[PDB]
């Protein structure tokens, strides 16, 4: 008889020296901590008007996760993680209407480790203006989720592709979208 | 490239009916395989795989550690629930509804939370046969969307209506389409 | 209000 779930999720990956810390509420990121600027980044600004979180505290957990990863690596006798490729999907925020601002969403799901290269391509060429993404989000099977966004003006003349690179794929993955 | 090693830690607070029932689950995951966990309904750490036994044995041997964890349901879970209640458990964004041909498509987007009910009608009669949904889609920005299609060859004098029921609205939304 | 984190525990050595 389930109702709600709050998850504090953190990870540390090795060669990369990459770690993340975030809170989740029923699948959505409440906030995550940026290790570099040592700050709490709220998913929606409004949230940061009604709540706070001591970021330093996350830096502390990560330091311990660093030490734990090393201990576990040795305990498992340097057994590498097994790659699991992403499942990619591209869709828009709402129904598309020419001349009406919309947003392309590239959804990367069910993959690990937490390392991906994501490039938006408009008619073959890279697009970066306005783009944004989320941190690697939690999954119940412990794989990850990730979202990339591209605000855009629909047109009969433009084509879009979401390019995803992951150590689990043999070759880059291109997901296509176009006004029907 | 070269070998990767991953360490994941999850603290899951499960709430049932507000905070009348709360279950805390601490999970340690090495390379995607959970090795040891503390389940508030068990009361102590347990190994999930043989790799986690050392940790279960070690942590369970420290009276203070177990003490804090058993009270985390209150000092951690119930506390954080109250902190985001106003913008999480109570967040409400109404669905934008639009209907268009393709198949009759009822697009319900930008809504929160996720539980929604979409129904199709023909001349006042509910069409429960020949409906198709791509399921609830999480946009990852605290909004959902869904598409509920009706297999029909649109005809004249006929009225098609999409009815949407959602927590954000008092009286169901309806968008009708005719030809 | 302020969110509270849960401290990670160091593994057995």
């Amino acid at each position, epitope marked *: 008889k389930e109702e709600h779930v709050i998850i504090q999720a953190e990870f540390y990956l090795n060669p990369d020296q990459s770690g993340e810390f975030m809170f989740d509420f029923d699948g959505d990121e409440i906030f995550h901590v940026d290790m570099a600027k040592k700050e709490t980044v709220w998913r929606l600004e409004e949230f940061g008007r009604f709540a706070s979180f001591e970021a330093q505290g996350a830096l502390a957990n990560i330091a311990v996760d660093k030490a734990n990863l090393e201990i576990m690596t040795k305990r498992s006798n340097y057994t590498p993680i097994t790659n699991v490729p992403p499942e990619v999907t591209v869709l828009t925020n709402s129904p598309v209407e020419l001349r009406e601002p919309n947003v392309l969403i590239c959804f990367i799901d069910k993959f690990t480790p937490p390392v991906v290269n994501v490039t938006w391509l408009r008619n073959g060429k890279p697009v970066t203006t306005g783009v944004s993404e989320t941190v690697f989000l939690p999954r119940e099977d412990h794989l990850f989720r990730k979202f990339h966004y591209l605000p855009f003006l629909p047109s009969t003349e433009d084509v879009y592709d979401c390019r995803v690179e992951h150590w689990g794929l043999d070759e880059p993955l291109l997901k296509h979208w176009e006004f029907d | 490239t070269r070998p990767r090693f991953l360490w994941q830690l999850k603290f899951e607070c499960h709430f049932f009916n507000g905070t009348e029932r709360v279950r805390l689950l601490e999970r340690c995951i090495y390379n995607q395989e959970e090795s040891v966990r503390f389940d508030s309904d068990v009361g102590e750490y347990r190994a999930v795989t043989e790799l986690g036994r050392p940790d279960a044995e070690y942590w369970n041997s420290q009276k203070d550690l177990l003490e804090q964890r058993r*009270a985390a349901v209150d000092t951690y879970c119930r506390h954080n629930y109250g902190v985001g209640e106003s913008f999480t458990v109570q967040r409400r964004v109404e669905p934008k509804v639009t209907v268009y041909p393709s198949l009759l498509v009822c697009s319900v987007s930008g809504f929160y939370p996720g539980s929604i009910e979409v129904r199709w009608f023909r001349n006042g009669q509910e069409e429960k046969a020949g409906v198709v949904s791509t399921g609830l889609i999480q946009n990852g920005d605290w909004t959902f969307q869904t598409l509920v299609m009706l297999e029909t060859v649109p005809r004249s004098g006929e009225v098609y209506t999409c009815q949407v029921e959602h927590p954000s609205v008092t009286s169901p939304l309806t968008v009708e389409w005719r030809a | 209000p302020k969110y509270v984190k849960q*401290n990670t525990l160091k593994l057995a050595t």
Partner: T-cell receptor, first 112, second 114 residues
Framework: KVTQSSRYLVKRTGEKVFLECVQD?????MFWYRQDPGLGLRLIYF???????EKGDIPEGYSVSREKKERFSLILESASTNQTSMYLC????????????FGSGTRLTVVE | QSVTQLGSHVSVSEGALVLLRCNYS??????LFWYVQYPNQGLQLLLK??????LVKGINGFEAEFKKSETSFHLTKPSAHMSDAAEYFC?????????????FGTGTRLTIIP
């Protein structure tokens, strides 16, 4: 045990003073406080990990360094007399069921 | 978070009641600690409030009660002993175990009168 190199130090004003704190328990967290009458212990700086510096409640006049995990060095760029005090160092780990382990402390008097 | 220790110097005749004040400011679940610095030695944890119980019994005969309403955690002892002369420090933290940053009060020096 958390060891502080010296127990007493007499230094001259405008000089660059180094106070060391070395711990051997593999603790991720280390802190530097100063103890003064009627002021109790006040946090100068602290580190939760390697290369992590975080200004405490009274950073002014001090700098710090944590290149290695075992060592947290407190620095006084140009020592002033107001910095004459007893410095306590503490270490701990967020991953441990207990708290602070204090160091011997070092009396430091800076005169002109 | 903050702590205040009203009364920097407290005189108490032995056999008499020892009361060392401590009030705190915490926008979060409080964890308080009482440290003692006996003459010629370092700070010792006397007792700590980990939210387990409200009346915390410490070493060397000391007691402390956490009053969420008064926002206090005063230290008491029915009969002052001469060896109780020392400086007492109150501390507050956000860590259940006191391993993340600690914020200390101004401290009180306790003198026992013979």
């Amino acid at each position: 045990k958390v060891t502080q190199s010296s127990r007493y130090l007499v230094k001259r004003t405008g000089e660059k003073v180094f106070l060391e704190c070395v711990q051997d328990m593999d603790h991720e967290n280390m802190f530097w406080y100063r103890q003064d009458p009627g002021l109790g212990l006040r946090l100068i700086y602290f580190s939760y990990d390697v290369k992590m510096k975080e200004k405490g409640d009274i950073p002014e006049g001090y700098s710090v360094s944590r290149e290695k995990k075992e060592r947290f060095s407190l620095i006084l760029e140009s020592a002033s007399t107001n910095q004459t005090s007893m410095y306590l160092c503490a270490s701990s780990s967020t991953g441990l069921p207990y708290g602070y382990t204090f160091g011997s402390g070092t009396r430091l008097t800076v005169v002109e | 978070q903050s702590v205040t220790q009203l009364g920097s110097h407290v005189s108490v005749s032995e056999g008499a009641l020892v009361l060392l004040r401590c009030n705190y400011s915490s926008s979060v679940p409080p964890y308080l600690f009482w440290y003692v610095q006996y003459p010629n030695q370092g700070l010792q944890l006397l007792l700590k409030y980990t939210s387990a119980a409200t009346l915390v019994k410490g070493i060397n005969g000391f007691e402390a009660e956490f009053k969420k309403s008064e926002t206090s955690f005063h230290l008491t002892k029915p009969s002052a002993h001469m060896s109780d002369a020392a400086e007492y420090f109150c501390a507050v933290s956000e860590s259940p175990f006191g391993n993340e940053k600690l914020t200390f009060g101004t401290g009180t020096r306790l003198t026992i009168i013979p």
